[PDB]
Amino acid sequence: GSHMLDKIVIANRGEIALRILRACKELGIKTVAVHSSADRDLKHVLLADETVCIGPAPSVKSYLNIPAIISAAEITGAVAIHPGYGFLSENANFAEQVERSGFIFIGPKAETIRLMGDKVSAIAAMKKAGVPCVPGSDGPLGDDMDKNRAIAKRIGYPVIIKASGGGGGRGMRVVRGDAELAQSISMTRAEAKAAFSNDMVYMEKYLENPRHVEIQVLADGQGNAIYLAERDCSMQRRHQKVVEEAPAPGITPELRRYIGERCAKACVDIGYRGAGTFEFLFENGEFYFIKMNTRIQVEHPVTEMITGVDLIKEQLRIAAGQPLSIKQEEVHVRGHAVECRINAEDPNTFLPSPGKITRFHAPGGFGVRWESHIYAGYTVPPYYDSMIGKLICYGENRDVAIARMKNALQELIIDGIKTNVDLQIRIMNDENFQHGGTNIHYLEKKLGLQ
């Protein structure tokens, strides 16, 4: 009924903030938009019920200023805090503290975060859960080469020496023979201490031509948990996602209930609460666990489209104590979805291109979703990311979804800055892409990338 959150803090900014603001307004939740002195002009900022300047431009003082944010709630009387994605969404000390200050944290518990935060641990947990993992050391590599030489041989080359601190493409090394093993473990151990401040490392097999399939889940922490089909995010350029889609072409419903059900089991097993995502590498009709994003993702709209489920409301629902409103058997995968991220960037340098938007026009029409905070005379700052929007198109089928997307990319007008739009069009036109089922290496190589 109405055992809903009185007022929550939107501990974020940009498109994500707007989106969250939107779901708040539908549930009647009051909103407090905390922002940085430079985001005083954010769309979402202008629509919030209450606003608060937490700091200066630089993230470490604003968006990552834990106290500032936490105090912002105090003064406002909010009951919860929504991290969105990418700042502290995966920061357990912030979750910890939010809890400790007596606020609700729109996400799982800190314990769960740290748990999934450490690859090694993560892996062990899921191995246990029945979730399919990459074969590797099933532990931190030791220091005596002999055994390590043995791990490898067993799992077989090539391999990959991965640290447990995550990072994001940073802290990884590919070994293909016994000769480079030693160096690798070492190079990698060193890259980790410095970077994440955790030299711990694990070994696993390296996958050549796999796709990136991810499973969306939801848990209430009451015993319920559902999977919302998969998403294909193989469209990468330097680890940066560019094109997401649901469902994943080539994925049979059977397969879909396979990895899903176990993903659902794992959630329960770990006492998972809220939204979250299971990242899988996919080669040879086989799934392999890479990690777990204990949060809402940038690409969630695609999934809300093919399912009709509103992720954010659900998070908000779980957060307020409610049980899952939906049952697995009520979840039905319908049509096809494709999201193109829109970036403020230089198609040559791939470098951020900040500036003010002079002219702007958004595409509309059937099965077209525009997710962005930009407008005309809006100034995109240099401080934060390059993403300014999400262009999501729906269709009774893939080919339809694609067609719409082409049109949409054209009606789209963003003047006064550099954007990745041309690129999007080009992919849309990608004959390989039209066929589909391309690997995470496709973009990089077509881009004439070395």
Ligand X SMILES: Nc1ncnc2c1ncn2[C@@H]1O[C@H](COP(=O)(O)OP(=O)(O)OP(=O)(O)O)[C@@H](O)[C@H]1O
**Which position among 173, 231, 291, 418 is part of the footprint of ligand X (CB under 6 A)?**
291
Residues 16-35, one symbol each (x = binds ligand X by CB under 6 A, - = not), give --------------------
Instruction: State the DSSP code for 88.
Output: S
Q: In this structure, what token pair is assigned to residue 67?
A: 């106290």
Query: 238 CB contacts (<8 Å, ≥6 apart)?
Result: 169, 350, 444
Span near ligand X by CB under 6 A; candidates 48-56, 58-66, 82-90, 198-206: 198-206
Q: How far apart are CA 370 and CA 181, in angstroms?
A: 48
Question: Quick one: 9 or 163, whose CB is closer to ligand X?
Answer: 163
Counting contacts by CB under 6 A, is residue 341 touching ligand X? no
Binders in 202-221 for ligand X, by CB under 6 A: 204-207
The DSSP result for 290-320, as a single string, is: EEEE-S--TTTHHHHHHH---HHHHHHHHHT
Query: Cβ(106)–Cβ(315) under 8 Å?
Result: yes
Counting contacts by CB under 6 A, is residue 140 touching ligand X? no
Closest distance of CB 392 from ligand X, Å: 21
Q: Is 369 a known active-site residue? A: no
**Which position among 134, 201, 320, 374 is part of the footprint of ligand X (CB under 6 A)?**
134
Closest distance of CB 41 from ligand X, Å: 29
Closest distance of CB 168 from ligand X, Å: 3
Closest distance of CB 207 from ligand X, Å: 4
Q: Find the helix or strand (DSSP H, E) in which 276 lies.
A: strand 273-283
Counting contacts by CB under 6 A, is residue 445 touching ligand X? no
Q: How far apart are CA 395 and CA 406, in angstroms?
A: 13
Closest distance of CB 73 from ligand X, Å: 27
Please tell me which residue in 273, 295, 317, 341 is annotated as part of the active site: 295
Question: Quick one: 18 or 440, whose CB is closer to ligand X?
Answer: 440
Span near ligand X by CB under 6 A; candidates 17-25, 85-93, 201-209, 340-348: 201-209
Binders in 154-183 for ligand X, by CB under 6 A: 160, 166-169
Question: Quick one: 120 or 414, whose CB is closer to ligand X?
Answer: 120
Q: Is the peptide bond before 135 cis (omega within 30 degrees of 0)?
A: no
**Which position among 127, 149, 193, 239 is part of the footprint of ligand X (CB under 6 A)?**
239
Counting contacts by CB under 6 A, is residue 98 touching ligand X? no
Closest distance of CB 440 from ligand X, Å: 5
Comparing CA positions, the residue from 137, 133, 171, 138 lying closest to residue 151 is 137
Query: 54 CB contacts (<8 Å, ≥6 apart)?
Result: 34, 35, 36, 62, 63, 65, 68, 69, 72
Closest distance of CB 163 from ligand X, Å: 8
Q: Exposed (0-12), middle (13-18) or buried (19+): which is 67, by Cβ within 10 Å?
A: exposed
Counting contacts by CB under 6 A, is residue 122 touching ligand X? no
Binding residues with ligand X: total (CB under 6 A):
15
Question: Quick one: 104 or 125, whose CB is closer to ligand X?
Answer: 125
Task: Give Rg (Cα) of the chain.
Answer: 22
Question: Quick one: 290 or 421, whose CB is closer to ligand X?
Answer: 290
Closest distance of CB 205 from ligand X, Å: 6
Counting contacts by CB under 6 A, is residue 128 touching ligand X? no
- In the chain, what are the helix, strand and coil shares in percent, each to the nearest 5? 35, 25, 40
Binders in 413-442 for ligand X, by CB under 6 A: 440
Comparing CA positions, the residue from 172, 134, 139 lying closest to residue 156 is 134
Query: 445 CB contacts (<8 Å, ≥6 apart)?
Result: none
Binders in 342-401 for ligand X, by CB under 6 A: none
Question: Quick one: 38 or 281, whose CB is closer to ligand X?
Answer: 281
**Which position among 290, 338, 417, 443 is part of the footprint of ligand X (CB under 6 A)?**
290
Closest distance of CB 315 from ligand X, Å: 20
Q: How far apart are CA 20 and CA 6, in angstroms?
A: 15
Question: Quick one: 9 or 203, whose CB is closer to ligand X?
Answer: 203
Comparing CA positions, the residue from 306, 311, 369, 304 lying closest to residue 336 is 306
**Which residue matches tokens 């003064």?**
75
Q: How far apart are CA 136 and CA 205, in angstroms?
A: 6
Query: Cβ(33)–Cβ(53) under 8 Å?
Result: no
Between helix 110-117 and helix 119-129 the angle, nearest 10°, is: 100
Residues that bind ligand X (CB under 6 A): 134, 160, 166-169, 204-207, 239, 281, 290-291, 440
Residues with catalytic function: 295
